[PDB]
Design a protein around this ligand. Sequence first.
Ligand SMILES: NC(=O)c1ccc[n+]([C@@H]2O[C@H](COP(=O)([O-])OP(=O)(O)OC[C@H]3O[C@@H](n4cnc5c(N)ncnc54)[C@H](O)[C@@H]3O)[C@@H](O)[C@H]2O)c1
Ligand SMILES: NC(=O)c1ccc[n+]([C@@H]2O[C@H](COP(=O)([O-])OP(=O)(O)OC[C@H]3O[C@@H](n4cnc5c(N)ncnc54)[C@H](O)[C@@H]3O)[C@@H](O)[C@H]2O)c1
Ligand SMILES: [Zn+2]
Ligand SMILES: [Zn+2]
Ligand SMILES: [Zn+2]
Ligand SMILES: [Zn+2]
Lengths: 374, 374
Amino acid sequence: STAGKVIKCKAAVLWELKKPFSIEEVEVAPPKAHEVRIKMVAVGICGTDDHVVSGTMVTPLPVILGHEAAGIVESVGEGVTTVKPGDKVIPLAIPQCGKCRICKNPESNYCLKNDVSNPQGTLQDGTSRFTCRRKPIHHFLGISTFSQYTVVDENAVAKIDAASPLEKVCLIGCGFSTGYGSAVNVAKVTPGSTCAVFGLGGVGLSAIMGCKAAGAARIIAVDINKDKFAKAKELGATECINPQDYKKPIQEVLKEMTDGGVDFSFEVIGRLDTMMASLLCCHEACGTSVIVGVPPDSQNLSMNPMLLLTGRTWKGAILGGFKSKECVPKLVADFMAKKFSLDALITHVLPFEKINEGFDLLHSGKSIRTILMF
Amino acid sequence: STAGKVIKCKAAVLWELKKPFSIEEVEVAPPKAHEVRIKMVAVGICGTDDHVVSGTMVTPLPVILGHEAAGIVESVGEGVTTVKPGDKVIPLAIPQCGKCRICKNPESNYCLKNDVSNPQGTLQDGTSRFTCRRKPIHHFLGISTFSQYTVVDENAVAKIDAASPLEKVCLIGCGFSTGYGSAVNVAKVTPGSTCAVFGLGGVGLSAIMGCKAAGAARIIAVDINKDKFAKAKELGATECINPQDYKKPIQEVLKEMTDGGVDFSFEVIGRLDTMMASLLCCHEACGTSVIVGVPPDSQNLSMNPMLLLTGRTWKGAILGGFKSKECVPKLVADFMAKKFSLDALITHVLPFEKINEGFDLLHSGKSIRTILMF
Ligand SMILES: NC(=O)c1ccc[n+]([C@@H]2O[C@H](COP(=O)([O-])OP(=O)(O)OC[C@H]3O[C@@H](n4cnc5c(N)ncnc54)[C@H](O)[C@@H]3O)[C@@H](O)[C@H]2O)c1
Ligand SMILES: NC(=O)c1ccc[n+]([C@@H]2O[C@H](COP(=O)([O-])OP(=O)(O)OC[C@H]3O[C@@H](n4cnc5c(N)ncnc54)[C@H](O)[C@@H]3O)[C@@H](O)[C@H]2O)c1
Ligand SMILES: [Zn+2]
Ligand SMILES: [Zn+2]
Ligand SMILES: [Zn+2]
Ligand SMILES: [Zn+2]
C-alpha cells in the first residue's frame, strides 16, 4: 500500500562537493501526472557521477546522483501508458519526449527535455520529489538512480524485457550504449579502417567493442593505466600503448605507427589534452575524431582551425546517438539474443550502501564497471 | 624558339609584406623533368592571395603569388605525358601526385605534395625557376600564376577543353570549386535543408550556388557588406542578414529564425569570431558546420567541447574536397555543358599590369572576382 503515498527509503545524498556520499533516509513523493516511481535493483558507477562529485560537472546541490540503472516500476501517475507497476525498466539520462524538433528528427537523440544543457536538478515540471532532513534534495539527469526509490518523467524511462537480468542490462542505460554507439552510429567506423580509443574505462572499452563489431582492422587502445590493457585486448584491441612510456607526444606516436594517422579516433576520458591528442592523431586529410568523454566545466580548448581545413571531421554525441526510450529496449533485446556480452565490463559488485567503496575502486583504477545492488 | 631556353617576361613580385605588387622583369627557367611551363591568359584574385600580402598567411618572401588561373602550355620537360604544347590548362593549388596515401584514398584530396602544410616557396624538387634582380624568387602553392609564364609540376596542372573560355574557367581553379564543393562534397547539403553562409565573396557565393544545387530549402546569406546581398539572392539565398543591424550575437539571431539552428553552416570569410558563430548557429543536436575560410596564421580558437558533445559535426576542406587534376577538367566539362554559370562571380576585368587595382576593388568590396588578363 505504497501507491499514492510518500515512501521512506535510503539514498546516497551529496551535500557538498568533493565529499563522500551520505546514505540517509529520504522521502519520495508519489508520482504525479505522467510520472513514474521506480524501485531500483542495480546501478553502475559512471565517470559522469564522479565528475559532479569533483565539481567538474556542474549541477545543483544537495542532490541524489546516479543515472546508469535498472529496476521495477512501483507505481504509475495519472496518464501513464508506456509502463505500469511490475515492469522492468531502465531510466534514461537523455529523455525522448517524442514531440520536440530533435525527437522528430530520425538522426538525432538530444531531446529538448534533457537536463544537461541547463541543469535544473528537477523533474520536467520544474519541481522535486525528494526530501531529506526537512530539506528538498535535487534530482540528477531527471532520473536520480542512487536511491532505492526514484520518481522520473514518463519520457525518461523505457520498458524492457521482463526476463532481463537487471544486474547486467543496467549498463545499457549509459555506459555500453554510449561507447558502442559512438563507434557504430556516430563515427560509423568502416570495415578495414584503423581506430584509436583513448580511455579504457567502461565506456571506452565498449567503444573498442563497437570498433570491432564495425569491422576495424586495427584498434589501438591508449591509457595511462596499463592494468586495463588485458581487458582491452580481450574486447578487440590489436595493440595497447601508454603515453607515459614515450618521449614524444602521444599523437606523434600514433601518426608514426599508422602512416600519418588513424581513420577514426575517440576520446573517452574527459580531458582537453587528450581531446586535442585524439583529434591530432587522426589523419589530417581523412580522419574523423569523436569526442565521447565529458570535459571539466568551463575549461575551453585552444585549437587551430587548420586542423579541420585540411580535411578532418570532429564530432561528438551523447548516449552514442541512440534515441533513448526507443533504442534502449532494442539493445536489451539484442543482449538477450547473444548479440554482445557485458560481463567483461563488470568487474566489481557491491551492496548499494557501500557506494563510496565503488568510487574508491574507480579512483584506484582496479575497476571498470562496479554494480551497486539495492 | 623558347623551348629549352630561359624566358624573360613580367610578373607581379611581392618583395615585402603589406606592400604593392611590383611589376618587374623576371626570368623563368625552362621546365625540368616532369615539369610544365605555362603561358598565362587569365587569373582571378582570391582572398588567399590577399592574406599573404597582409602577412596573415605565412609563406616565404620575396614571392610571386597567384593560384586561381588558366593558360596555354608552352613547353613540357622530359617525361611529361598528361599535357603538351598548345593545350589549355589550369594549374592546381593542391596537386594530385597519384602516389601518396591520400591520392589513393578516393574520398580525400589534400595530396602530400601540397605546399600548404609546410610552405617552402619552391617547386616539388625543392628549387625555384624564378629570378628577378639577380635574386631567386619564391613560388606560391607550387603554381605562382601572377606571372606571364610560370613553371609548375606535372601533377599540379590539368588539361582542359580546348574550347574552354579561359577568362571564365580560371575560377574553377580555386574560387568556384571551393565554394560549390564545400556544399556538395564536404557538407553534403541534403534536399529541404536549411543552410547559413557567412561571407559573400566569390567563394561564399559559390557555396550558395552549391546549396541551391544541393536542394536546400532555406539559404541564409550573412555579410557586413549589404551591397553583396543582390548577387547572393540572385544565386540562391532566400534571405540575407547583416550582423551590424542587430543587438544580439549573429548566432543567436540565426538560431531564433531557424528554430534552434541551421542544418548546415558555412564560414567563407576567414575570421575566428565568424567561425565560432557559424559553428554556434547550427543546431546543437544535428548541425554540421564546415570551415571554408582560412583564418590568420597562428591565431587559435577557444572552444568548449560540449558544443560538439550534444551532436554537432565540425569539418573543413581545401578545394571543396575535389581531387584537383581529376575533377578540374570534369567541372570544365560541366561548365561547357551549361551545368552552372560563372558570369555572376566575375564583376571586374583588368589587364595584368593593373593588378593592384584589383586588390583595391577587393578591399573596397565593390568586387567579387576580378580577372586579370595578360
Ligand atoms: N558522451 C556520453 O554520453 C557519455 C556517457 C557516459 C560517459 N561519458 C563520459 O565518458 C568518459 C569516460 O567514462 P568512463 O565511464 O569510461 O569512466 P572511467 O573513469 O572508468 O574511465 C576513465 C579511463 O580513462 C583513463 N585515463 C585517465 N586519464 C588518462 C590519460 N590522461 N591518458 C590516457 N588514459 C587516461 C583512466 O585510466 C580510465 O581507464 C567520462 O568523461 C564520462 O563522463 C560520456
Ligand atoms: N578552403 C579553401 O580552399 C579556400 C579556397 C579559396 C579561398 N579560401 C578562403 O575563403 C575566404 C573567402 O575568400 P574570398 O575570395 O571569397 O574572399 P572575399 O574578400 O572576396 O570575401 C570575404 C567576404 O566576407 C565578408 N566579410 C568580411 N568580414 C565579415 C564579417 N566580419 N562578417 C560577415 N562578412 C564579412 C566580406 O564582405 C566579403 O564579402 C578567404 O579566407 C579565402 O582565403 C579558402
Ligand atoms: Zn524530445
Ligand atoms: Zn553515464
Ligand atoms: Zn584561393
Ligand atoms: Zn598525392
